[PDB]
Design a protein around this ligand. Structure first.
Ligand SMILES: *[C@@H]1O[C@H](CO)[C@@H](O)[C@H](O)[C@H]1NC(C)=O
Ligand SMILES: *[C@@H]1O[C@H](CO)[C@@H](O)[C@H](O)[C@H]1NC(C)=O
Ligand SMILES: *[C@@H]1O[C@H](CO)[C@@H](O)[C@H](O)[C@H]1NC(C)=O
Ligand SMILES: *[C@@H]1O[C@H](CO)[C@@H](O)[C@H](O)[C@H]1NC(C)=O
Ligand SMILES: *[C@@H]1O[C@H](CO)[C@@H](O)[C@H](O)[C@H]1NC(C)=O
Ligand SMILES: *[C@@H]1O[C@H](CO)[C@@H](O)[C@H](O)[C@H]1NC(C)=O
Ligand SMILES: *[C@@H]1O[C@H](CO)[C@@H](O)[C@H](O)[C@H]1NC(C)=O
Lengths: 299, 207, 46
């Protein structure tokens, strides 16, 4: 209406708003062991690429950045910026050592020698690929010979298969038993490594992560991190998995050592224990009320 | 032996991990009725009320499970249970004849630290245990009074744990409705069954 | 598949330079670039 008369009218309601955001969790436990595969003393050959599977653990991926300025970090599918959301179904990490300019052969779709006879990778794979230089750890000034690769074999490898089968190549048209000799060769040539080698011939350590999905168990594997806390301030709190809005204050309760929730007669939360540390806090709703406008006659 | 006695007003566990003070709460789900038939010594029914006196009980055995395929060892050292034919009885022996994957290994300290009371329940996705110990007052019969039952272990994996084997008392549990009383500090001091006599039903109705 | 935050409804983006701030312009680490290669030419079935 365009006019009002004498009286007090209940017009609106007022309340305070939260300022910060608080999240908490019972830290982490059972961490997936990425570190043990990223820092060892040996890395095996190329065609004998070690295989490992890990599951039923929480994941961090924070150890990835704690290394050298990675030569290549081309990861397909999932993006490093958003550290995934799903726990997939299983994950595998494959590690080996190759020679310099051969790192380009590790790709979804390509061809060559390493990615054709030694370690085949299908295009439908997404995973991630990591490679970094290690010239100062596995290169002695006498000729390294503990790394070998296959260079003479027919029937280009099918995706994700390993063939540790040393034989005598039958290049020719004669039977060959034992010593190769003429018109007959032996695969698995060595590498050689010296500290004065030029760039592109220095050793590189390569780790590829491949994970698969579409199954039921192990849905989400998140870090479930936590932040700081505030006192005497209208804020939104997310202790453990219970959310709320209000002001927290340390409470002189007698919580038994197996419970975290707290209630009252009217079935409302009024006491919560901290996830990480052991402390009980009472919760009070932020101030609110009604507003009345005492107005005399508008005439 | 199939000796029988009176269960009395014992066998009440905490329905959930929630703190209350000076209030009464009505709770559903499985419980142990007052004044029931308890066997003073087996498809596991629904729950187990194992209440062995075992005054000294240095070590006896805690065999649980269901063809060399859930065994629990209650020695003074770590329990170490696993999900996996021997019948045992300086060492233990007589039990290392069936071997399998035997994974899900955890726990650090023995369940045993009198009268010891343990309630075991199994739901479709969890295996819950509850334990309590009380001093004896030098009497054969169960003591008169009420006491709580704290929860100890909730194993995530388990379907149909049936067979068990340790003077002890065995009782079974069924779904019921109870009314529990919380004291000032926040511990259960009294309980009322809502389907025993009309007076208790009236008490439950009136809260 | 990278544009930070989230995309508003009925919005079309025609910009492709780089993702994240990256070390320098970054023409390895960071600067992973958007528009992952989309090859459906291999017949994987339906
Ligand atoms: C890497 O080497 C070993 C093997 O993991 C590890 O104990 C050590 O702390 C690591 N060194 C550095 C400098 O990270
Ligand atoms: C979780 O880990 C943090 C980090 O040390 C610790 O302060 C906290 O007490 C832990 N919470 C537990 C074990 O419940
Ligand atoms: C309870 O157990 C059986 C019921 O089949 C019976 O023999 C016994 O007398 C009953 N009462 C008591 C007090 O044990
Ligand atoms: C106690 O029992 C566990 C369960 O098998 C066993 O691993 C441990 O060695 C035992 N300790 C002793 C002292 O017998
Ligand atoms: C390990 O043990 C069983 C029986 O030997 C085996 O069939 C199965 O692979 C494993 N069981 C579980 C529950 O993982
Ligand atoms: C577990 O055992 C019960 C009998 O005690 C049986 O009815 C049930 O089918 C069993 N569970 C499975 C998954 O077979
Ligand atoms: C509650 O705990 C306090 C702690 O000092 C104690 O003094 C009091 O007697 C307790 N009240 C009970 C158990 O009813």
């Amino acid at each position: 209406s365009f006019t009002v008369e004498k009286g007090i009218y209940q017009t609106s309601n007022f309340r305070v708003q939260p300022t910060e955001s608080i999240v908490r969790f019972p830290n982490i436990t059972n961490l997936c062991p990425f570190h043990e595969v990223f820092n060892a003393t040996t890395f095996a050959s190329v065609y004998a690429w070690n295989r490992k599977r890990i599951s039923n653990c929480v994941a961090d991926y924070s150890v990835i950045y704690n290394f050298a300025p990675f030569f290549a970090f081309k990861c397909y599918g999932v993006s490093p910026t958003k550290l995934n959301d799903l726990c997939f179904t299983n994950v595998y990490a494959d590690s080996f050592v190759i020679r310099g300019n051969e790192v380009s052969q590790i790709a979804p779709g390509q061809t060559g020698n390493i990615a054709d006879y030694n370690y085949k990778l299908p295009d439908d794979f997404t995973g991630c690929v990591i490679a970094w230089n290690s010239n100062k750890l596995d290169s002695k000034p006498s000729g390294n010979y503990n790394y070998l690769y296959r260079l003479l074999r027919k029937s280009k490898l099918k995706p994700f298969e390993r063939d540790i089968s040393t034989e005598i190549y039958q290049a020719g048209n004669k039977p060959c038993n034992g010593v190769a000799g003429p018109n007959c060769y032996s695969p698995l040539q060595s590498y050689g490594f010296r500290p004065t080698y030029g760039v592109g011939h220095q050793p590189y350590r390569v780790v590829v992560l491949s994970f698969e999905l579409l199954h039921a168990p192990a849905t989400v594997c998140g870090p479930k991190k936590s932040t700081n806390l505030v006192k005497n301030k209208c804020v939104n709190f997310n202790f453990n998995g219970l959310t709320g809005t209000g002001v927290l204050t340390e409470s002189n309760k007698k919580f038994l050592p197996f419970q975290q929730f707290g209630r009252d007669i009217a079935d409302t939360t009024d006491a919560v224990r901290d996830p990480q540390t052991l402390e009980i806090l009472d919760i009070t709703p932020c101030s609110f009320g009604g507003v009345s406008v005492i107005t005399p006659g508008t005439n | 032996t199939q000796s029988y006695t009176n269960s009395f007003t014992r066998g009440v566990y905490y329905p959930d991990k929630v703190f209350r003070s000076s209030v009464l709460h009505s709770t559903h789900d499985l419980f142990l009725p007052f004044f029931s038939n308890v066997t003073w010594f087996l498809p596991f029914n629904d729950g187990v009320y194992f209440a062995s006196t075992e005054k000294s009980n240095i070590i006896r055995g805690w065999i649980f499970g269901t063809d060399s395929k859930l065994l629990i060892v209650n020695n003074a050292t770590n329990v170490v249970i696993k999900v996996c034919c021997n019948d045992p009885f300086e060492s233990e022996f007589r039990v290392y004849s069936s071997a399998n994957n035997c994974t899900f290994e955890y726990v650090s300290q023995p369940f045993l630290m009198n009268l010891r009371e343990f309630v075991f329940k199994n739901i479709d996705g969890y295996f819950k245990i509850y334990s309590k110990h009380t001093p004896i007052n030098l009497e054969r019969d169960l003591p008169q009074g009420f006491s709580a039952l704290e929860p100890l272990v909730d194993l995530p994996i388990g379907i149909n744990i049936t067979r068990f084997q340790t003077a002890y008392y065995v009782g079974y549990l069924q779904p019921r409705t109870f009314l529990l009383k919380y004291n000032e500090n926040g511990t259960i001091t009294d309980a009322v069954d809502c389907a025993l006599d009309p007076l208790s039903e009236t008490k439950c109705t009136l809260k």
